[PDB]
């Protein structure tokens, strides 16, 4: 295997990994550890927007809000997140919105599986084709 047996939090090559105490293999999926939320792949906290058991959270780079560490979910309220070329909108509960949304008078569609805005072309949603701008805003009309 790629890793030897470790348990709990360990530092490897400049990153903190979490290994399951009962199996000594890297953690996978969402976990709250000491009141900090992470989304793991093979022990390594992932950085980005991922779906946890109460919706999409922003698992942020270190020092984004309240001195969070790499991959720790952060408070992120009532604003857009423009990450890696993709567009999200976060509500008052610090979760990314999904489906049809009206924001500042404009209509968006946030993909249910990724929370990313449909953007930059024609998208088929529930049998109907719509046009979305590069900014994720739905144009007038049917296509």
């Amino acid at each position, epitope marked *: 295997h790629h890793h030897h047996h470790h348990t709990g939090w360990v530092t490897i090559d400049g990153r903190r990994y979490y290994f399951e105490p009962n199996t000594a293999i890297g953690a996978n999926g969402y976990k709250i550890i000491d009141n900090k939320n992470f989304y793991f792949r093979n022990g390594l906290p992932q950085i980005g927007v991922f779906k946890g058991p109460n919706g999409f959270e922003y698992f942020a*780079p*270190a*020092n984004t809000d309240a*001195n969070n560490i790499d991959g720790q979910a952060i408070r992120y309220q009532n604003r857009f997140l*423009h*990450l*890696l*070329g993709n567009i999200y909108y976060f509500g008052n509960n610090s979760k990314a919105v999904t489906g049809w949304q009206t924001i500042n008078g404009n209509m968006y569609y946030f993909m249910p599986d990724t929370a990313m805005a449909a953007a930059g072309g024609l998208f088929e949603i529930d049998g109907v084709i719509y046009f979305f701008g590069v*900014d994720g*805003v739905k144009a007038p009309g049917i296509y």
Partner: nanobody
Framework: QVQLVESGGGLAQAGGSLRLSCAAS????????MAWFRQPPGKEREFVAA????????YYADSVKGRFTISRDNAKNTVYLQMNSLKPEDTAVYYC????????????????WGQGTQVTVSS
């Protein structure tokens, strides 16, 4: 703890060139768009340029299109503004910015702002 620091400003003659650098520290910006804004005397802050996380996709104010070029080096956590064919109209305090939280990158809503560097162009 996070700082954006502009350098490369100052005086220049019309038709000439300047290169601004904005060095970021305290947090990695490789996932965020980065931008330049400017504030002319008496007027409000205005959009100049913005570049995507990798640097592949760029947007420019109509005023500066063709003359100004935005680029970035993520290994250095730095964004640049190459200012060619300078005009007296370009005279302004220039600000670098990162991580927009408004609807689009043109809007003056960014999570991090530089201190600003004075640029003066003479006729």
């Amino acid at each position: 703890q996070v700082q954006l620091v502009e350098s490369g400003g100052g005086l220049a003659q019309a038709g000439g060139s300047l290169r601004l650098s904005c060095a970021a520290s305290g947090r990695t910006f490789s996932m965020d768009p980065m931008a330049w804004f400017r504030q002319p005397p008496g007027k409000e802050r205005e959009f100049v340029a913005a570049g995507s996380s990798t640097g592949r996709t760029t947007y420019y104010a109509d005023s500066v299109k063709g003359r100004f070029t935005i680029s970035r080096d993520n290994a250095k956590n730095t964004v640049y503004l190459q200012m060619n064919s300078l005009k007296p109209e370009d005279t302004a305090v220039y600000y670098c910015a990162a991580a927009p939280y408004g609807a689009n990158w043109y809007r003056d809503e960014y999570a991090y702002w530089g201190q600003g560097t004075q640029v003066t162009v003479s006729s």
